[PDB]
Design a protein around this ligand. Structure first.
Ligand SMILES: Nc1nc2c(ncn2[C@@H]2O[C@H](COP(=O)(O)OP(=O)(O)OP(=O)(O)O)[C@@H](O)[C@H]2O)c(=O)[nH]1
Ligand SMILES: Nc1nc2c(ncn2[C@@H]2O[C@H](COP(=O)(O)OP(=O)(O)OP(=O)(O)O)[C@@H](O)[C@H]2O)c(=O)[nH]1
Ligand SMILES: Nc1nc2c(ncn2[C@@H]2O[C@H](COP(=O)(O)OP(=O)(O)O)[C@@H](O)[C@H]2O)c(=O)[nH]1
Ligand SMILES: Nc1nc2c(ncn2[C@@H]2O[C@H](COP(=O)(O)OP(=O)(O)O)[C@@H](O)[C@H]2O)c(=O)[nH]1
Ligand SMILES: C=C1Cc2cc(OC)c(OC)c(OC)c2-c2ccc(OC)c(=O)cc21
Ligand SMILES: C=C1Cc2cc(OC)c(OC)c(OC)c2-c2ccc(OC)c(=O)cc21
Ligand SMILES: [Mg+2]
Ligand SMILES: [Mg+2]
Lengths: 428, 434, 128, 429, 428
């Protein structure tokens, strides 16, 4: 379990995906040309997990950039680290998906998918020991949601033994691009519940609320939201990218975080929360903030459910004794929010290398039953439209059946009742 | 890739086409001879290129009489079009839908389809058709509906969008226009995916009130209409910050196939003589909800919104647009149907509105065109249906249509479809159960 | 005093012995084959192989559904074209029949007038 | 829809027809030789509608002159613009019609009709896009009424797809040529109701009354009456002859003016009313008021006794379009009870920069009014007063006609009147 | 010369192996290159000799992933081992016993047995095997039990001793370690003759309390473990008198085959940063819970055997006087209340740069007490909490293991706890 293959699909997927590569390239000492100009050997120790080594000791992201519209591909290429990507790894169509899941999954996306699988296959075959895939995409549009979930199912068929990890952006009316977002999201969640091993739920509702309420930004842009996403993505993958503590891989993470196969949707959290242009922060403050509902990247109150499992990762030079004491304090004082039938279900990791700008940080990864609130929110929006068959002709026009909507809604309602089941389950 | 074919039918369609293509040329720096002294490649959606660098509109002009198209053939832009794109007959439909659709139309329909096929066969990814026509003319009503039916056979579900001129007494109407209007609406309904009605009374009032024109001419009306048509199509002809393709327009505006008639509102409309601070994004966006700037006379304040698409052009950044939409989202007086959780679609284009020299509009830094699907547009159907009913109750003028091979059953069948359409707009606005 | 030391062994790198404090309270009397191991390992391999096969069968059904969706979209488009072609042909034939009938009836009325005018000319000769 | 073929039949038809060509030739800058000597390009823009272009850039009226008597056509040939007409287009007999409809329709006219159709066919086949026919004739005589209606039916049979427009002169005992005019007129109206698309009712009763009462002419001649006719004919065809906002043709006019096929008889009107010795400025409000006044109607009907189904007003001369629009709206709002409510926007106005000869401003009115039933009732009363006594009937039966044909023509005219009454009483409710 | 083959499985086994062989080298004067500048021949039980006078460990290192063994391959002692005795796969067992035992283990088991056979062929009187592994890892648990089963088939009756690492939350544990521990304990039970469990919590506490290490590392833990392992194996590597062969461990400590888990207690553990402790002082320390290897309470259990292994400056007279004071600790009624005592003249060697101080004399007590059952009880309870909800079981079943193996393994643990209870009751 060494190399991960990254895929970014659609506008959102490519925008957050490019930000991810800019952030971790900075952390690993890689400049926009692909040259290493860092000072620590710890930066290069596990750089093979995300980068391929090329002529002249160059480091090339093992990233595949996908879109049914050429516009975003051009904007990534012109972006800060746009020149770092392998030019052959840009796979794009000419006729978009018109924010339609059916177009991305069944029609326009199905015409492009084999070209993407050819580039996935080329990357995968050059891996000494591929551990799995990591997809960044939104669930509210057509390409990232429709074509992204089509790619997941095709990848599962070709690599059934590899881990499929996603960073899935959930839609919100507070920052919306299209009217049909609830349809696209429900159809996608239906796919993720069956075909992914671990999914990070990045809620635009939560990101907007953090920007508006906490960061006091009257009008948040996608750049403000994406700053929180990139910080979370950097934190959540620290264990994979950096040496020390534990040789972390995607499968070990999944086996320790996922007690039941369908319950693999994680509530990410971050501390401290900062603006694009934003102290000191202590260990007790980092620990308290990281477990606060206001620091969650999914719009769910963790105090409304229970944690099945938790992974907390601290970054920066700090007292390991203090981290251990604060983590124990939290569990002992908030015992009713942790499932008693999974002993030692809160794991902590500490990395010496802090992220850019911060001298101390803490990333939270929670498998909480409260995530059912996110799915219920999408479900309420879905049925408000579906009861009136609003905009349905755009999906049935592509060959879909009304029954396929009924099935996707049913499976999401089942996922919610399964979370409720373990929220009520006590020790016996 | 992503090509759009424009089809201009009858006098109104042709004359509005002249204003649109003049404006497009000016916006893209294309000379009347097709040469483009020279980047942004997107203009190729509307213009093909010859080996000798000439840029030719992907357009067809059709009329059953030659005098309107003859002015194009001898005018400033005569060199822009290839003769085969400008199609004329010898005798018009005489303001009779039946002559445009059957008697006269049948004689030229195959030739028109052949020329459209020739343009389609130069496309590698045709997005659809944009059809310009009046409701009241015999050609605008009759020939258009015949063409629309034939396009559905030759191009299946390929998108067909309309720009339809809705009749007004102030702007040269004929007695039978309400008949032609209901007949064309009935026959075109299942073949059209989206239709932008332009009420001649609304344009006339905007010219009088905002441009200080005492008695507006068709040139005054068409130049204003072209500015709105350009705002709708700019998303296809330019690469902006936030783009909206043809399929995206329809997905975000049309909740049900029959409910496909958005209301257009444009701002700002300022006189060239008006001597004057520049309007903010919030100011021009707020103006979209004021009735004075609507393209159809109706009252959205007393209806319900189903969708809202804001098309900005010029000096505009997303942050300012989002702040303007946030204030609109907290306006109790603007009501959306309960089945629409998020009704906005935004598009932003870098290129500000273009001023035709000798035109009536002032040069602005930023402008916006809102396309809203409101239940209030059914007022426009109601007014036309009432005029139809006044005459039809006496069978006045129906003999002219029956004489051309039509049956009285078609009149009542067209009218029953309009009654169902009014009822569909009523049902779509009612609250959902539980 | 209640201890018995009993020497055990002695060698160049050490010495050992036993020290019994007290004797026991109760002084009385108080191979899987390679084939069978292989059988367990092979049964697990066949269970893993069965579950992967079931997953790929589920995915094969998905691909079949995806093909059915595309085909359905094509068929609905073809049926729309077919119905539009038929409806239009019917409509234009109904107009041809009507136009032909209206014109035929108009000429018949004028032909009757010709017959009457011949009768009036005949009536004039009759009076002379 | 470009060319119009003009036909003039009988004494009245050829006399008003010659006046028509003299007036419009002067308006178009055409001299009696056929040469253009005008200054405005607007004069030649739509010249092709009424004129054929010949050798030496000559303009020849697309006119066919018909009569069963050679007399009137000799006077036309010697008349002012008599030399402009195509000599081959004069089709005439030697034995007249003796003011007998039966002679023109069944006997003498039937012998000459095929010769006329040959010259109609020749003119029509040289048209790029023939829009229709225009016939000038009287209904009181025998050739224009009898043979004119025979020509209409023959033309309809050969050109069923073209418009048939007539300028039909209605008889009056105030300026009558014979006692049998009510018979000839009723027999003709019976034909026009079935075979014409639009008929302008030029009433000699109205023309005489305007000359006697308004113009104060003690003894009006046909020249005095024809001056009013030529002014009306010039006005009513302005939209056909000149380029303007309205691209006008005969079919578009018919579809907007005729709501029911049989109700196609128009009440023309004109302002200002002048004598043949023309002289001096009528404002737009005055023009608008006068043109809707009963005294300005070319049919002897009071429009205030009925309702307008449709109205077309054509203003000529340099004037404010804003003022024309305001005055026309004022008239409709103040006189709303005289316009049918069930035909929205039933009053159309056009403005032509070119004024007629002698006037700097003028207004022509074309009304489809239910009050026209008064004209038909007048003819009907005179018809039955004679027919009940079977007076002069041997003139018609002598030509082979039956008494039953009279009964049918009277019945159809009575039906015409009741149909106008039906729409007069009709309410939107 | 009876030989002993050491087998080190997984990360814990390999890393502990590194510490043991470093210590053995220092004790015997063997350099990192295998040269021995130079009698007592007994060190040949653990080291073979080459024609070029190089002394090579009779050891095999195995892991399903290469990074831990790669450090041995490039480290200080890289020349000590022949490449063939360092065996690695490409992907680890992901903390999954079923993955290590059934899926991945099956791919490398024959290669491992071939390398062990090659070492066994170099023996003229193989005593048996010493197997080092963790209970919690997927390789340590899964591959070890597979290897132990195969060793019983290929080397029937030849002694197999274990050094097993028992999991502790304070020393990098994973959520599923209780499952892996009970699964491996069940399958290995009939194949092991004697197992020395090392509780990571006990070692962690000794490092914190006795060595003043605030947050001990695996290097700190392993160096202390190696000192105890060396005390146990010194009897085989020097010409001694007690525990002279592997069979004697079973004889002296294991009267009942299933009850084969002795408790090790070591003293003194002094920080390298005080007068030297007497035989009486270090012997007294053997009965203090603070110095045990497994956290449990022998004061409330019954002894079945007690072996005292002294190293350094120690004479029988002082040992007997120390045992006379200890008499003034309950044995089962079937066993005599007594001690088997061994002295090895070589004092404990400590690693330079280490945390332990150099001592004149030290002692390791090996006692078979019923109190060690407390360790099973703690593990069984954690297993029961998760298993009642079937949490994480899908990961094992997905690897081909049956759900019935969980309950079968747990039933064997219940019988083992019952055996410890029965063994303590009075005889009849
Ligand atoms: N906005 C606008 N309306 C126009 C224009 N030309 C005509 N109209 C309106 O369209 C209606 C008349 O239809 P036309 O387009 O002129 O008729 P047509 O398509 O040529 O059909 P025909 O009867 O065969 O000549 C009236 O309501 C006019 O006011 C124009 O250039 N601009
Ligand atoms: N004392 C000690 N414990 C260790 C060491 N390395 C890992 N562990 C413990 O062993 C357990 C984890 O098992 P590992 O040995 O790392 O697993 P593995 O055998 O490599 O198996 P996989 O990685 O799952 O294939 C935890 O209880 C750790 O605390 C070490 O060197 N010393
Ligand atoms: N956080 C975030 N969400 C985005 C961004 N751009 C678009 N989205 C969201 O993604 C959804 C629209 O899908 P998008 O990825 O743009 O369309 P696609 O190209 O069809 O996949 C909506 O929920 C948007 O709010 C971005 O940069 N950041
Ligand atoms: N206004 C007008 N009426 C005329 C003229 N000549 C005759 N009439 C009328 O026409 C009718 C007689 O028809 P006429 O044309 O003389 O007979 P025809 O030659 O047989 O067609 C009578 O009602 C006359 O009053 C004329 O030049 N002008
Ligand atoms: C479209 C036409 C065509 C037309 C054609 C005309 O001349 C051919 C004409 O002049 C008499 C007309 O009156 C101004 C008209 C005309 C007349 C009347 C109308 O309603 C009563 C109308 O709406 C429109 C028209
Ligand atoms: C052994 C792992 C693997 C792993 C791997 C990780 O990175 C891939 C990681 O950081 C996100 C983790 O959280 C600290 C972990 C991780 C997470 C959670 C655990 O219990 C809830 C646990 O016991 C152990 C693990
Ligand atoms: Mg027209
Ligand atoms: Mg491992």
């Amino acid at each position: 379990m060494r190399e991960i293959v990254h895929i970014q699909a659609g506008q959102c997927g490519n925008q957050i995906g490019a930000k991810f590569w800019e952030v971790i390239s900075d952390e690993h000492g890689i400049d926009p040309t692909g040259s290493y100009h860092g000072d620590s050997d710890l930066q290069l120790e596990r750089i093979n997990v995300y980068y391929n080594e090329a002529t002249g000791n160059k480091y090339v992201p093992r990233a595949i950039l996908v879109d049914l519209e050429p516009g975003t591909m051009d904007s990534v290429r012109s972006g800060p680290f746009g020149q770092i990507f392998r030019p052959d790894n840009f796979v794009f169509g000419q006729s978009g998906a018109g924010n339609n899941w059916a177009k991305g999954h069944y029609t326009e996306g199905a015409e492009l998918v084999d070209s993407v699988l050819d580039v996935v296959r080329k990357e995968s075959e050059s891996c000494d020991c591929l551990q799995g895939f990591q997809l960044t995409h939104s669930l509210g549009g057509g390409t990232g949601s429709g074509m992204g979930t089509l790619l997941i199912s095709k990848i599962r068929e070709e690599y059934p033994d590899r881990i499929m990890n996603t960073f899935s952006v959930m839609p919100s009316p507070k920052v919306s691009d299209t009217v049909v977002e609830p349809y696209n999201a429900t159809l996608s969640v239906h796919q993720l519940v069956e075909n992914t091993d671990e999914t990070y739920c990045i809620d635009n509702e939560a990101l907007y609320d953090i920007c508006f309420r906490t960061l006091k930004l009257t009008t948040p842009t996608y750049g403000d939201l994406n700053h929180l996403v990139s910080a979370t993505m950097s934190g959540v993958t620290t264990c994979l990218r950096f040496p020390g503590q534990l040789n972390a891989d995607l499968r070990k993470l999944a086996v320790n975080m996922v007690p039941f196969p369908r319950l693999h949707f994680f509530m990410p959290g971050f501390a401290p929360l900062t603006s694009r242009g934003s102290r000191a922060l202590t260990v007790p403050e980092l620990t308290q903030q990281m477990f606060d509902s206001k620091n969650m990247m999914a719009a769910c109150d963790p105090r409304h459910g229970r944690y099945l499992t938790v992974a907390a990762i601290f970054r920066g030079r700090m007292s390991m004794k203090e981290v251990d004491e604060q983590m124990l304090n939290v569990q002992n004082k908030n015992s009713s929010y942790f499932v008693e039938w999974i002993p030692n279900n809160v794991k902590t990791a500490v990395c010496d290398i802090p992220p850019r700008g911060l001298k101390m940080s803490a990333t939270f990864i929670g498998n909480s039953t409260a995530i059912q609130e996110l799915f219920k929110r999408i479900s309420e929006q879905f049925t408000a439209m579906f009861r009136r068959k609003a905009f349905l002709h755009w999906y049935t026009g592509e060959g879909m059946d009304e029954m396929e909507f009924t099935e996707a809604e049913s499976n999401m309602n089942d996922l919610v009742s399964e979370y409720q089941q373990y929220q009520d389950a006590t020790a016996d | 890739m992503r090509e759009c074919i424009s089809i201009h039918v009858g006098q109104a369609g042709v004359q509005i086409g002249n204003a649109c293509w003049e404006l497009y040329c000016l916006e893209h720096g294309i000379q009347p001879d097709g040469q483009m002294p020279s980047g942004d490649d997107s203009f190729n959606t509307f213009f093909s290129e010859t080996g000798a660098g000439k840029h030719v509109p992907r357009a067809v002009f059709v009329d059953l009489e030659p005098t309107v198209i003859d002015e194009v053939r001898t005018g400033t832009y005569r060199q822009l079009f290839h003769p085969e794109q400008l199609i004329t007959g010898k005798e018009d439909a005489a303001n009779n839908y039946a002559r445009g659709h059957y008697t006269i139309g049948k004689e030229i329909i195959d030739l028109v389809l052949d020329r459209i096929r020739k343009l389609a066969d130069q496309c590698t990814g045709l997005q659809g058709f944009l059809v310009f026509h009046s409701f009241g003319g015999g050609t605008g009503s009759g020939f258009t509906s015949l063409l629309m039916e034939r396009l559905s056979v030759d191009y299946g579900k390929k998108s067909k969008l309309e720009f339809s001129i809705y009749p007004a007494p102030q702007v040269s109407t004929a007695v039978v226009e309400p008949y032609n209007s209901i007949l064309t609406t009935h026959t075109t309904l299942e073949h059209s995916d989206c239709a932008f009605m332009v009420d001649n009374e609304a344009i006339y009032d905007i010219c009088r009130r905002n441009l200080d024109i005492e008695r507006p001419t068709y040139t005054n009306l068409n130049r204003l209409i072209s500015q709105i048509v350009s705002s709708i199509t700019a998303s296809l002809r330019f690469d902006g910050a936030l783009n909206v393709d043809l399929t995206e327009f329809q997905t975000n505006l049309v909740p049900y196939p029959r409910i496909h008639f958005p209301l257009a509102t444009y701002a700002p409309v300022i006189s060239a003589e008006k001597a004057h601070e520049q309007l903010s994004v919030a100011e021009i966006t707020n103006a979209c909800f004021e009735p004075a700037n609507q393209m159809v006379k109706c009252d959205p304040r007393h209806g319900k919104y189903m969708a809202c698409c804001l098309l900005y052009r010029g000096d505009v950044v997303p942050k300012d647009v989002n702040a303007a939409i946030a204030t609109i989202k907290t306006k109790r007086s603007i009501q959306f149907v309960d089945w629409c959780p998020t009704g906005f679609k935004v598009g932003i284009n870098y290129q500000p509105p273009t001023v035709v020299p000798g035109g009536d509009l002032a040069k602005v830094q930023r402008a916006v065109c809102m396309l809203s699907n409101t239940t209030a547009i059914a007022e426009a159907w109601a007014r036309l249906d009432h005029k139809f009913d006044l005459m039809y109750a006496k069978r006045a003028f129906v003999h002219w249509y029956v004489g051309e091979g039509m049956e009285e059953g078609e009149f009542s069948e067209a009218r029953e479809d309009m009654a169902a359409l009014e009822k569909d707009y009523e049902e779509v606005g009612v609250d959902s159960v539980e | 005093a209640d201890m018995e030391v009993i020497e055990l062994n002695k060698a160049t790198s050490g010495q050992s012995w036993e020290v019994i404090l007290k004797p026991p309270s109760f002084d009385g009397v108080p191979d899987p084959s390679l084939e069978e191991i292989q059988k367990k390992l092979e049964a697990a391999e066949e269970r893993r192989k069965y579950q992967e096969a079931e997953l790929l069968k589920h995915l094969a059904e998905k691909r079949e559904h995806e093909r059915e969706v595309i085909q359905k979209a094509i068929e609905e488009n073809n049926n729309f074209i077919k119905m539009a072609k038929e409806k239009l042909a019917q409509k234009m034939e109904s107009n041809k029949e009507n136009r032909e009938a209206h014109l035929a009836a108009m000429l018949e009325r004028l032909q009757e007038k010709d017959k009457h005018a011949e009768e009036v000319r005949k009536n004039k000769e009759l009076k002379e």
